[PDB]
Structure formats: structure tokens, C-alpha cells
Design a protein around this ligand. Sequence first.
Ligand SMILES: Nc1ccc2oc(=O)ccc2c1
Ligand SMILES: Nc1ccc2oc(=O)ccc2c1
Ligand SMILES: N[C@@H](Cc1c[nH]c[nH+]1)C(=O)O
Ligand SMILES: N[C@@H](Cc1c[nH]c[nH+]1)C(=O)O
Lengths: 412, 412
Amino acid sequence: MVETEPVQGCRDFPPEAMRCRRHLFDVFHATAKTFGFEEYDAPVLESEELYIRKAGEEITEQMFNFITKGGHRVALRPEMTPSLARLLLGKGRSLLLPAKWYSIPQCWRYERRREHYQWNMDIVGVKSVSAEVELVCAACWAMRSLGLSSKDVGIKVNSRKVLQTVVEQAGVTSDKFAPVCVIVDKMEKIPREEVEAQLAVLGPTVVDAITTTLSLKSIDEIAQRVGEEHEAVKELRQFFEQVEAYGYGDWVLFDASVVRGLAYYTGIVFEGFDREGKFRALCGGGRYDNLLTTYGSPTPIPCAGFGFGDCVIVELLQEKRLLPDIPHVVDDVVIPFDESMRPHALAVLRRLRDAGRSADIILDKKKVVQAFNYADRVGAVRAVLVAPEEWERGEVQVKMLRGFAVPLDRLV
Amino acid sequence: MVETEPVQGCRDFPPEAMRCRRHLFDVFHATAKTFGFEEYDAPVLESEELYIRKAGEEITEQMFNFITKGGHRVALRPEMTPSLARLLLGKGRSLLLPAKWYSIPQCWRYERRREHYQWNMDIVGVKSVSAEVELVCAACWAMRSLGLSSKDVGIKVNSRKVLQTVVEQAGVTSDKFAPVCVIVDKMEKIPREEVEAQLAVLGPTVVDAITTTLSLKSIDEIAQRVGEEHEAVKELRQFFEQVEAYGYGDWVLFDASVVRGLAYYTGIVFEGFDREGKFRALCGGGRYDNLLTTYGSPTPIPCAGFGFGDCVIVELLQEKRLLPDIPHVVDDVVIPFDESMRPHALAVLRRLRDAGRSADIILDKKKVVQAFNYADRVGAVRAVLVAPEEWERGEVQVKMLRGFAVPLDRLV
Ligand SMILES: Nc1ccc2oc(=O)ccc2c1
Ligand SMILES: Nc1ccc2oc(=O)ccc2c1
Ligand SMILES: N[C@@H](Cc1c[nH]c[nH+]1)C(=O)O
Ligand SMILES: N[C@@H](Cc1c[nH]c[nH+]1)C(=O)O
């Protein structure tokens, strides 16, 4: 017997599970359309070189990579943002800006689940915090569309520029900044000792300064540290003013501990969370204004975006009882009275489908009662019995499942 | 500079290309719903063991396989049917039958394009030709939905049982039958000499018999060879009677040369083709009643299905001028008169999206004329200018792009 289980860390989606996944994806697609984003895609297989960032990132450390027969170093993508930038870099000046692009790629890791789907939303060519505002609103909109409220979830927001100043002023060379963010991202996960030790290895005074600024609880307190008109203060203020104007003020808040784990974030960063403190981050993103420059863009291209995985959100929705099983449905099941009626039933099936209805025909030889049972099992709205006596009169028998003779023309 | 091109043999789908792909997939999804099929999915990564059929198949020969870090032999799936059977075998008696399942997996090869998407449609648990009838009608329906007619395309249909008889009667051991089909499938591609030589290696008289039955041009001629009531003759006759009753008689025909290249087909086989003779097969499928038994099913499970790739169909549609560029559209573009109006414009943006409309807001600081230009470029139906004078009156200016003051409430 063949192995029935899927490959290690990978999920099967039989129809029941697929309906749940489709319920989620339908929201991702619907939200992107509502917000005027355009779909794109790229190959799950990318060059390994695309992800070599040398910053100690979990995402690049846990890369599902291999070598081809032809000796090329490839990887099943651990994230989408590098593929997006590749695409953008390829287009150059032909790309009209601003651009708002989205996708729902399967992304991979190797270390535990080894694959997940991740809704990606990115705004390209927008310098101002208006981009981050729209992105955060889009994530909130998706969560609201799924049945959650601002009592269930929120989005924590910060700017890496605050920390950038502290690292720069303390005297640390800026090439260590991305490594620092990556390490400080571990704070909530591991003891402050371990995190303190990691920064020591990187290269005590400056470490204290980092720690203090992470734990500042309000924006006023940040403004006391760096000034009321520091770059980050005005941007965060504008960000909250705009989100409030859109009507999502209750969904967002400031949190100085939020840095995210990716090397490339330069500005505002954010992450979604459940207000019971039970789950990992629901989504995460930020501004990354230098990535395209590091890829070789002759001109700086401002960018911002987020990823929103398919797994944590599902656990939250299940906890909140927002993912009831939604059984399969079909409009019509056409039932031949017997096999002599099959040709006529097929003509009827054609008509129903011609009208835009979803319809089955009983394919096996079976008794009328069992055909009605099958009709119930598949969630048919209507059973259409095609029998000789009614057929003679230009009719079929129609029975609403949630048996009257009806002229063919009146079926639809 | 990073490599902008995708990995060898793999496609990027920036928004323009993605719209075309989505036009196709929308038809695949819509046809499956019309026909009452249920979506499923499984991992692109499967165990290599799943595909080791030892029959000289092109599909298993050109397998994109590799070994994991942990030494497990895996493959990016070359086709979906084995994953489907794995899923079915896993469910056992819990699976209610008949079942009609579909998916649109990316499938992979290594040798030239190395990936394609392939719409898969399969009916499980149906013994009679009614399954093949529905499947062939579904493929025709998809092609019609894309703008093609029976003048553009058709589906050629045959049964492997005819050949099975000839191979069995000639005295050849039945374990060579699948290898024979695989070889005879090459007939149209390579010279009859090469094909004749391949069968010789497998193990002259029986070879002639095979050749003769492949070139019989009608079903009556098959009935002369094997009898009017041979198993295959009654099934083919019933198949054409049913397709004709559904109203697709003009789309289908008999062709004794059609065997397909897969080892597992046992009965009716079929393939779509363009009637100008310019392209490779548009789709292909058949009945495979023994596969689940070879996977270890305690009870035989009848199955039939097809695959329908995303590449050949697109070339055909382009030749027929049925894939015009469909530019991006959005309902509204909201334009702040200036930055002082941004908060109010955001409130307006919220209202529009609340009503189910697709809407952008101008994110950058820009002049009203350039904002109107951007609105045209993104294919906006309407520009909503949010200006101080109108705002004072509880109004905005609305301009149909394919400028009158309008009360907020009347926008939607
Ligand atoms: N890169 C990345 C990150 C997180 C992930 O979480 C999963 O559960 C499966 C895959 C995955 C891939
Ligand atoms: N197994 C399989 C068969 C045919 C294919 O044709 C392509 O163009 C790309 C991938 C592919 C994979
Ligand atoms: N690639 C990021 C999310 C993201 C998209 N755009 C910007 N950031 C992640 O995987 O967490
Ligand atoms: N797996 C087959 C198509 C198919 C689906 N179901 C049965 N046959 C192919 O790739 O050609």
C-alpha cells in the first residue's frame, strides 16, 4: 500500500478543508479588489541567491533549498517580497507608479509545518505614510470581513527609525542595524539575557539604550527621547490620524517593542495580534525603502507591504467559532426515472446549466429514492425528476428540498 | 544586480499576464461549479515513490525530483492524478460516492517550459460511460466559455479495451499492455519504423494487428473486428448517444489512434484538438479503473478524469483573437483637493468601500490634474474630488470618466 499521508509538514485539502481555505482566500481576494490592488504571481522555485541577506534572519536560516540536476542553487520561496522586487526591478521605468500588487503564494520552510499560504499586499512608489495607512486598514478589513472585531484583534505599530537614531547616535556602524533589529525581534520569545548576549556578540551602554527605547509605552514618551518633530514622531502621528479618519482607530495602537524579524524594514513596522494573548502574530509588515537599491535599482523605490498567513488566523477564527463547516451545495440534481429517460434528462441538464445553474445528473443506475437521498447528501436545492408521463406532456417533476409538474421552459 | 529573469523554464505573472491567467482559471472554476464538481488541493511536493510506475512514461521519465536534507526522495508533482488517488485511498469507506473533484495544480517537469497549470477534473465511483460523457462535456463547456466553437476544436474519443483484446488474443502477456499503449501513443510524433522497433524490443504478427486496429476510421469497422456487442462497442455507442443528447454531438468524434501516454488508462480515452491541425493536444483524459487497486485499495474503485493545461489553450485563443488585453478597472478614485482634505477623503473612501465598491485614494501628494490622469490610467469609472467648498455643503464632486456636486449619502 502507498503512503496515504502527505509529505512531512505539508497539508492535504480534501473538499471539506478546501471549502475553509476558499472562505479565507475569497476574503483576501475581495479585500484586495475593494482596495484596488492587482494580482500577480511568480514561480515557487526561485534562485537561492535571491535570499542571501547575511543578517541572521530566521526566514533565510530555515530555507527549503536544494541543487538542481544542472548544479543551480534553488529554493522553494520562504517569502514573496524578494520575488516582487525581482519583478519590479525587471520592469524598471516601464512600471507605472504608484503600483499596488497582491498575491497569495504558498511559502516554504525546512527545520513543525513546512508550508503555509501567505496573502501578500504591497504598495510601491509611495513615499508617505499613506501607504502604511492603507495596508493596515486592508489587514483590518480582511479580519472584519472574516467576522472579527476590534475587541478580538488589533494591529500594533512602530517605526524602526526611532531605534535607528539610537543605534546611530550610540556610535554603532549602520551595517549592524539590520542584525540588531533581527536580534531585538527575539525579545518577547526568549529571555532578555539571551537577547542581551546576542547583541554583545554583535559588538553594554548602547544595549541599555536599545532596551529602554523598546519599552517606552507611548508616542509622547518617544517624542521626549528624540523630539516632538523627529522624523518618526511626525510619521507615526500622521499614520494614526489617517487610520482614525478611515474609521479604524479602535483597531490600531502604538507599541515600541515591535520591530519585526526581517532585515529590510526601514520605517513603520506593524503586526496583528489577538487581544486574549493566545496566538502568534496574525500578520506582519512594514516599509522597506532600500531593498530595491540593494538589488541594483539605479533609483530608490519606496515600498511597503505585509504578509498575512493562513494558519494562525484559522486557529483564531476556530476559537471564536467563526469557521462553521459550510456544506457543499448545488442548485439542481436531475434524476432519470430510469435509464430509458437518460437522454431526455441530459437535455434537461443542458438547459439548467445553460441558464447559469449548478446541476448534477445521477450518473449511476439507481432507484429514485436513493437518487433523492444522493440529492440531499450533495446539498441540492432542487430535485428534477425526469419521468415518462411528465415528459410526454413537455414537463418534468420538480421538488424543492429546502413534486410538482413544470413545463421545461419554466425550469429556469 | 540580482537576476531579474525567473528560474529556467518558469513563468512570471505580472498583473497584465495575471489577468489573462485569471480569465482562464475563472472559466475552469465556473465550469466545475456548473457541473457540480468540488475543489481540492494537495502539496506540490509528493513522495517520488508515488510516480514509480515502470512503464516508460514520458511523465515519469521527466520528473523534477530531488532528495531532502533528511534523505527522503521527493518530487514536484508531474501530474495530479496520483495525489488524488492518495487522498481517495486515505479516506477509504468514509468517502461518499460518487465523488466529483477538481483542482488547478501547477505541475512540473525537468528535461522547454518546466511548469504549467493543469485543470484536473475527475469522477470517482462511477462504473458507466456517463462519467466520461460528463467529463468530455465539461471540457467542451470550458472551451465554449472561452469563445471557441465546434468549428474551432473537437474531442477525439477511443477505448483502450479494443486494443486490449488484440494484445490479449495475440498471446502477449497483459503486463506488457500498459508499455504497449505508452509506445503506440508515440505514433503521430515519430515514424512508424521507430514505433515498430520499440514494440520489437518489448517482445511482427501482433505488431501488424496493433497497427491495423489503430487506423480503423469508424466504429462500425471496429465492430467488424471485435463484434457489434464487444464491450468497447456498446460503451462507445452509449457515449456518443449521451453526448449527442446533451447537445455537444458536433464537438466529439471517434478516432482509433487515440490511446494517450499514461499507463493507467483502462477504458475510454480522449483528447481535445484544434481543427486546423496547428497545436498539440488541448486536453486529455480517460478511465482508469485499476489505479486504486494498484495503490492497495481492498475494493476496486472506478475512476475517470482529464487534465487541461494552461499553455496550448492560450496559444489557440491568441491565434483565434479570443484573448484581448483586459485592462485593470476600479470603480472610484478619491482625490483630495489638497493634503488638508486627506482626512475627509479617507472618510469618503471608507463609505465607498463600505458599499461594496472598489476604490483607490490618491496616496502621494499631487496636483488635481495629475490625479485625474492617474484615475484614467488605472481605469477608474468615476473620480471623486474631495474639495473644501463642497465638503462644507456635505458634498463631493463626482466626475464620470466613461464634475457635479453630490451629497455624501448619494455617492453609493
Ligand atoms: N517562510 C515561512 C515562514 C513561516 C512558515 O510557517 C509555516 O507554518 C509553514 C511555512 C512557513 C514558511
Ligand atoms: N508533467 C508535465 C507535463 C507537461 C508539462 O508541460 C509544460 O509546459 C510544463 C510542465 C509540464 C509538466
Ligand atoms: N515578506 C514579509 C511580509 C512582507 C510583505 N511585504 C513587506 N513585508 C514576511 O514574510 O513576513
Ligand atoms: N493525469 C493526466 C490527466 C488525467 C486526470 N485524470 C485522469 N487523467 C495527465 O496529466 O495527462
